[PDB]
Amino acid sequence: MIEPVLENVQPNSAASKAGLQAGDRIVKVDGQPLTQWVTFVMLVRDNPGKSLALEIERQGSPLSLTLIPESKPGNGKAIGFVGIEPKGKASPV
Numbered sequence: 001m002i003e004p005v006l007e008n009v010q011p012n013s014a015a016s017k018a019g020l021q022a023g024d025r026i027v028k029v030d031g032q033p034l035t036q037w038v039t040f041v042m043l044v045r046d047n048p049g050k051s052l053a054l055e056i057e058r059q060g061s062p063l064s065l066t067l068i069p070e071s072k073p074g075n076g077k078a079i080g081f082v083g084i085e086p087k088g089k090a091s092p093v
Contacts, residue, residue, distance in 0.1 A: 001033045003057065004040070005087040013083025018067045020056070020084070027062075028055035037086060041093050044069045048080035 003025040009015045026040065027033060030053050034040055043052060048071035056063050069080025085092050 002035055002037070003027050004034065004037055006084055007087040008085040010083030010085075010092075013081075014068055014070045015082045015084045018054070018065045018082075020054075020065065020067070021058075023058070025057040026054060027057050029053070037090055041090075044082050044093050045074070045079045048072075048078055050080075 006015075006020060006022050006024045006026070008022055009020045029040060029043060044067075048069050050068065052067045052069070054065045054067050056065060067082060069082050071078045072081040073079075082093060
């Protein structure tokens with residue numbers, strides 16, 4: 001299991017609207033823990049306009065949020081985008 005920490009949540013984004021903040025850890029997505037960051041990336045990219053149910057940990061306490069990716073231009077199709085930068089060496093999603 002992994003629990004990715006957020007480094008930045010862009011203003012005026014799906015993630016900011018969802019109430020996410022830097023320091024939050026994503027512990028569950030749609031009722032199941034993440035084991036790879038790429039899984040979250042694909043779930044966001046593939047699902048513009050859909051409601052993703054998040055469980056996060058905030059300072060060690062659980063919170064539930066609803067994240068709805070915005071539709072943005074993609075290389076082959078429209079993709080979802082939420083405006084999150086994870087802690088580490090990954091690209092924004």
